[PDB]
Design an enzyme around this catalytic site. Structure first.
Site, short mmCIF file in Angstrom:
data_model
loop_
_atom_site.label_atom_id
_atom_site.label_comp_id
_atom_site.label_asym_id
_atom_site.label_seq_id
_atom_site.Cartn_x
_atom_site.Cartn_y
_atom_site.Cartn_z
N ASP A 233 0.82 -1.22 0.00
CA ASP A 233 0.00 0.00 0.00
C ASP A 233 0.86 1.27 0.00
OD1 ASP A 233 -1.89 1.90 0.20
OD2 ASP A 233 -2.89 1.10 1.96
N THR A 234 1.00 1.89 -1.18
CA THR A 234 1.75 3.15 -1.26
C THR A 234 1.05 4.30 -0.55
OG1 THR A 234 0.71 3.73 -3.39
CG2 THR A 234 2.74 2.45 -3.43
N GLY A 235 -0.23 4.18 -0.27
CA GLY A 235 -0.94 5.27 0.40
C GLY A 235 -0.84 5.22 1.91
C1 LIG Z 1 -0.13 6.20 9.53
O1 LIG Z 1 -0.41 4.93 8.92
C2 LIG Z 1 -1.58 4.80 8.24
C3 LIG Z 1 -2.62 5.74 8.28
C4 LIG Z 1 -3.78 5.51 7.54
C5 LIG Z 1 -3.89 4.35 6.77
S1 LIG Z 1 -5.35 4.06 5.81
O2 LIG Z 1 -5.54 2.62 5.69
O3 LIG Z 1 -6.43 4.89 6.39
N1 LIG Z 1 -5.09 4.64 4.25
C6 LIG Z 1 -4.63 6.06 4.17
C7 LIG Z 1 -5.25 6.88 3.03
C8 LIG Z 1 -6.78 6.86 3.19
C9 LIG Z 1 -4.73 8.31 2.99
C10 LIG Z 1 -4.42 3.69 3.32
C11 LIG Z 1 -5.37 3.37 2.17
O4 LIG Z 1 -4.68 2.71 1.10
C12 LIG Z 1 -6.55 2.45 2.56
C13 LIG Z 1 -6.10 1.02 2.99
C14 LIG Z 1 -7.28 0.16 3.39
C15 LIG Z 1 -7.70 -0.93 2.62
C16 LIG Z 1 -8.80 -1.71 3.00
C17 LIG Z 1 -9.50 -1.41 4.17
C18 LIG Z 1 -9.11 -0.32 4.94
C19 LIG Z 1 -8.01 0.46 4.56
N2 LIG Z 1 -7.55 2.38 1.50
C20 LIG Z 1 -8.85 2.75 1.69
O5 LIG Z 1 -9.29 3.31 2.69
O6 LIG Z 1 -9.60 2.40 0.62
C21 LIG Z 1 -11.05 2.55 0.77
C22 LIG Z 1 -11.46 4.00 0.44
C23 LIG Z 1 -11.86 4.01 -1.07
C24 LIG Z 1 -11.59 2.58 -1.57
C25 LIG Z 1 -11.70 1.67 -0.32
C26 LIG Z 1 -11.03 0.28 -0.50
C27 LIG Z 1 -11.24 -0.63 0.71
O7 LIG Z 1 -12.64 -0.78 1.00
C28 LIG Z 1 -13.26 0.49 1.31
C29 LIG Z 1 -14.67 0.23 1.84
C30 LIG Z 1 -15.83 0.33 1.06
C31 LIG Z 1 -17.09 0.07 1.59
C32 LIG Z 1 -17.21 -0.31 2.92
C33 LIG Z 1 -16.07 -0.43 3.73
C34 LIG Z 1 -14.81 -0.17 3.19
O8 LIG Z 1 -13.66 -0.26 3.91
C35 LIG Z 1 -13.75 -0.61 5.30
C36 LIG Z 1 -13.18 1.44 0.11
C37 LIG Z 1 -2.85 3.41 6.73
C38 LIG Z 1 -1.70 3.63 7.46
#
Ligand SMILES: COc1ccc(S(=O)(=O)N(CC(C)C)C[C@@H](O)[C@H](Cc2ccccc2)NC(=O)O[C@H]2CCC[C@@]23CCO[C@H](c2ccccc2OC)C3)cc1
Lengths: 99, 99
Positions: free
Chosen positions: B25-27
């Protein structure tokens, strides 16, 4: 370009005639941009993340220029702490993770 | 390898003697792993993303194996639905984003 990950991979994007800074986010399936005005029809939708859910507006077939590369796809607009470019657009600029 | 982004960039990792599946995860600034016991001392931390914040336990100097590399660094353990390998470890395996 080749982008290392010592710093957040932020890029300039062009969307709806506006410039924004955004994060290339391989862990996001979808692209989420902070509140802004965009043309055309949108659908209300909810999406989740690590802390809970937020309400967004879904716009389809939006043209976005990511670091000078043109792409088209769906963009969700809402109260995100950072603009994130997810995989739905990263594939369209040909982005790969290499190690 | 070279990993395209048409699917989630999921890899097998070894941590705490256990095999888990995780996202490259680059984000993500830091690495966040689902609840497990790790053999060291931890400190409290809160991290925020889309939707709010979660409380995690911070463990330092944890060895994690990711595809032939061994990275050592900080791991955050808490109620995440998906295991996330963040930039703090991606830099140690030499990962770059290319387009
Ligand atoms: C200091 O260190 C950290 C601080 C914060 C974080 S971080 O993780 O906050 N982030 C930071 C970014 C938001 C700036 C990393 C990001 O890559 C997350 C990873 C992630 C994947 C899966 C589940 C939960 C997190 N992608 C995400 O948030 O992607 C979501 C948002 C849009 C697409 C998405 C894919 C996953 O399913 C989501 C969803 C959809 C419907 C219902 C429930 C859902 O999810 C619970 C939707 C990390 C380290």
């Amino acid at each position: 370009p080749q982008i290392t990950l010592w710093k957040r991979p932020l890029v300039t994007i062009k969307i709806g005639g506006q410039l924004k800074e955004a994060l290339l986010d391989t862990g996001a399936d979808d692209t989420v941009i902070e509140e802004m005005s965009l043309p055309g029809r949108w659908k209300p939708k909810m999406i989740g993340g690590i802390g809970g859910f937020i309400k967004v507006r879904q716009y389809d077939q939006i043209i976005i220029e990511i670091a000078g590369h043109k792409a088209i796809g769906t963009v969700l607009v809402g109260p995100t702490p950072v603009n994130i470019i997810g995989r739905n657009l990263l594939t369209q600029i040909g982005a790969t993770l290499n190690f």
